[PDB]
């Protein structure tokens, strides 16, 4: 059992220390198994060796873990990353001087899944910001430059890795337990990620998805929330929200009108941006989720600021098939099928935002949107 192993190391680490190389070879072999009982014991054999042995055998523990993360096995990489996180939390000072070897995993991100890349950045970020000593500051600025040269990489995969790593670092950077100079430093990191991902729509979508998950599941400093909510709210208004007074204009081969309104107003300018692509409209749903969460966090669940987005109409064409389904060309249906998907995704995200309300007419609008999702979904199969 764990307690037998814990008691063994605790009082008789003097005799076990002579054979740290032998124990680690045993620990490494145990980790190659397929049973959780064996895998958990092998991970414990790594953790107890790091805790009770000397500096040299501790470097062997970290070096052994780095090999597992670079091995390729999903089971080994996941387990070894958990061991590394435990070691960082347990003994940040000992892991502080082993960061050079941990940094070396960044050279082998090709054979690592995006889920494991996020975890690898989390342990690196939490180790770099564990202490405020001069040793940490070297790693902190080292981690910033690694991501900075990944964000600007021409290779698209490394551009996405830079977004994942930079959003992950900002979570530890702004984690609530923050001075102004830290608050502007994390803000500058986000401004870097925003600028780099602006051109690519799918890369821009990843930034919204990763940063929204950070707001939802992590508690950050209020000042950090103050800036992010301000920049998102105004940019979203300028990007998609348009006034309903001004009639639409363009060279559209379809009649463009305001559709799916409720009951001088704002509207979602969905169709012209989609047509001009013949902020991207493909990012409308992930961006709005980011806006909703940031507004919610500052006001502690209160959401009067985005009330108009629920009932605002959507600029859409005559989506009902007027006995012209066969005459429709391939380009027109392919465009319109994407029109339905973006409209459905917007309505699904709208439902997500206002599903926790209490007021009666507040709920009826959500149900009306839910009805709109169902009926407009039937139109999709046409």
């Amino acid at each position: 059992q764990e307690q037998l192993l814990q008691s063994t190391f605790s009082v008789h680490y003097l005799v076990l220390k002579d054979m740290c190389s032998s124990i680690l070879s045993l620990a490494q072999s145990l980790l190659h198994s397929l049973d959780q009982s064996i895998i958990s014991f092998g991970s414990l054999l790594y953790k107890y060796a790091f805790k009770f042995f000397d500096t040299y055998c501790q470097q062997e523990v970290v070096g052994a873990l780095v090999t597992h993360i670079c091995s390729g096995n999903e089971a080994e990489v996941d387990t070894a990353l958990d061991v590394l996180l435990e070691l960082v939390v347990l003994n940040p000072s000992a892991m502080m001087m082993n960061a050079v070897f941990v940094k070396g995993i960044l050279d082998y991100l090709d054979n690592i899944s995006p889920q494991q890349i996020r975890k690898l950045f989390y342990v690196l970020s939490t180790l770099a910001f564990s202490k405020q000593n001069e040793a940490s500051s070297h790693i902190q600025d080292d981690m910033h430059l690694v991501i900075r040269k990944q964000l600007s990489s021409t290779v698209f995969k490394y551009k996405l890795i830079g977004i994942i790593g930079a959003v992950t670092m900002a979570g530890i950077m702004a984690a609530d337990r923050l001075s102004d100079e830290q608050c502007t430093q994390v803000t500058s990191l986000l401004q870097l990620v925003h600028s780099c991902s602006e051109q690519s729509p799918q890369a821009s979508a990843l930034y919204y998805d990763e940063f929204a998950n950070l707001i939802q599941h992590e508690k950050l400093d209020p000042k950090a929330l103050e800036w992010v909510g301000h920049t998102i709210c105004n940019d979203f208004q300028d990007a998609f929200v348009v006034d309903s007074c001004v009639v639409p204009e363009g060279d559209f081969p379809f009649p463009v009108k305001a559709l799916y309104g409720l009951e001088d107003g704002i509207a979602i300018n969905l169709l012209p941006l989609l047509f001009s692509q013949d902020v991207s409209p493909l990012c409308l749903a992930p961006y709005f989720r980011l806006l909703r969460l940031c507004v919610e966090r500052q006001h502690n669940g209160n959401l009067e600021e985005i009330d108009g987005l629920l009932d605002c109409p959507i600029f859409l064409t005559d989506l009902e098939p007027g006995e012209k389904l066969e005459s429709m060309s391939a380009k027109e249906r392919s465009f319109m099928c994407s029109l339905i998907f973006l409209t459905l995704n917007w309505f699904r995200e709208i439902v997500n935002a206002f599903c926790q309300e209490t007021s009666p007419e507040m709920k009826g609008k959500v149900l009306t949107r839910l009805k709109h999702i169902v009926e407009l979904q039937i139109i999709l199969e046409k």
């Binding site: 940094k103 070297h138 600025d141 080292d142 040269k149």
Partner: protein, 330 residues
Amino acid sequence: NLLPFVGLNNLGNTSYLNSILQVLYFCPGFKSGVKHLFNIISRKKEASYELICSLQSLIISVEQLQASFLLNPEKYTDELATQPRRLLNTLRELNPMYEGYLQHDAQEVLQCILGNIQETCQLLKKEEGFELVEKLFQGQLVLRTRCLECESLTERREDFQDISVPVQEDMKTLRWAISQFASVERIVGEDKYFCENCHHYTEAERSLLFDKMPEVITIHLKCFAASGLSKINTPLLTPLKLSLEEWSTKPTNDSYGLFAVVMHSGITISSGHYTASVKVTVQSLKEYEGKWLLFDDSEVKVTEEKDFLNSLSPSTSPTSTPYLLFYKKL
């Protein structure tokens, strides 16, 4: 908020080249020399040379954007910079290691640039001011060996472009580093000197002396050690004023003033980031005289002298390790 100083865009892991180019651009007489070589080549062509042409294009490009910004500062909002794409491409032909988007040594690329400039000068002079590198970066060393048995002296003459000095023992100042370079050292034990006067292996004393001094003193800091290769993050105490009289064959009153530092940011030697910090030597440009510009790729800042030296001090541990120091003759 944009300063009237043109940065260089990162073409992918090319801050090693950007830091060198910004130092070379502000090096006294380097722009003048490259222009002179271009004139000779252009007239010779109109009557191997690509690197001189590529350097000329980059210098002109930096000059024009600097000119345009002064006339119409409203044309540029985020950053003022240019791309050394042509110069980088020439380096790929001269040296195949630069093909790709890998990370490279900043001193090595400076050596490649200066080495090929001298080759072009020699070829042009052979076919035929012309001594660009030699008057600027090249000096003369006198290396003396003293056998401890017979006490006979043997001397060697060797040129040098940079002075490679240690930063660690195996706080310390730049004086200590040059002492470990040029002061007398005893080679004993496994490294005994073979005296041809004794026809035997003997202990000897080796000392290096500066015979001819160039206009620019480049100091290459060995901020890296072996046991296994690691990076030494602790700098020396770099002074603004440097006198090499202690290690010179003749007594000189000529002192040198620091005007450029190339730094490396990173915890390892295999990867990192290179930045350059240069001291500034039409009417609006004189407000930056005596100030230091930090060239982080396409971003240019400005720092007061007293603040910049404190940033170099080992007491306030900096994340950017000095790697190349450039001193110009006063």
